[PDB]
Amino acid sequence: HARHMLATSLVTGLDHVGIAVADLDVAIEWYHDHLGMILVHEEINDDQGIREALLAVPGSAAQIQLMAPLDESSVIAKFLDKRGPGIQQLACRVSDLDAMCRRLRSQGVRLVYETARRGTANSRINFIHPKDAGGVLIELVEPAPKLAAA
């Protein structure tokens, strides 16, 4: 029971799975109707150039993040144009993003950002450089304390 295993990293679980979709509105209803997922949150990431919908999966702490491009400069536009909709990122929840990123760089692994950016719900995020992880995009997510938002 991995919920009862002591960790060896600063990873505390899976934050979300990011899925690039064509039309976000139809996708939200489809995931809700057929899988019972619930639209918990919706927002624009201007930094990343995407429109996102956060779906809760009742019984589980990990979310499904549906993503659609805001414009063609989006990281999601590239993905969608080359292969259409698909699973585009795996996001690990982390307790100290700074600490893990320093540790990763000490281990020879590149990160995409010098400084964390803001993800969904004003979380702080970085990415392992995808070419260090063999084309897989791994995001590291530190949720912000609710006070920090205010």
Place this chain on the structure above:
Amino acid sequence: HARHMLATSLVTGLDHVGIAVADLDVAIEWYHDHLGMILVHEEINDDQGIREALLAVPGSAAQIQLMAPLDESSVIAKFLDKRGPGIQQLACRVSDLDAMCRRLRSQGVRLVYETARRGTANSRINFIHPKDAGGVLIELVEPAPKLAAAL
């Protein structure tokens, strides 16, 4: 909080995220060394022609399922020729696979298999037809009773 929300479907959670990799053993060490994931199971799926490694994420119930092709005939091999390594499947844990599948079919959603197959470690599995899910491969996973695997 979503862990304490009563579900409206037979999905009880996220079973795993499936990742196609080129070399299983080096990927295992990479995910363990850098993300702290722990190898809890390794097996060969002769039907789908893949070798698999299940990684626990301590503090979490969902797993990472690394997959490498055994035969060029496998779905993982085709995925790797076209796009290289990448995230290839999202797997929902379900409390009753057959009931879920009948509900999905009466809702107008197709399933890949007529009858469930065995997934990693005896679980019973099916897939929503990827064309029905806009190109995304969604697996439905029912863990099998431990007694089933012994018989």
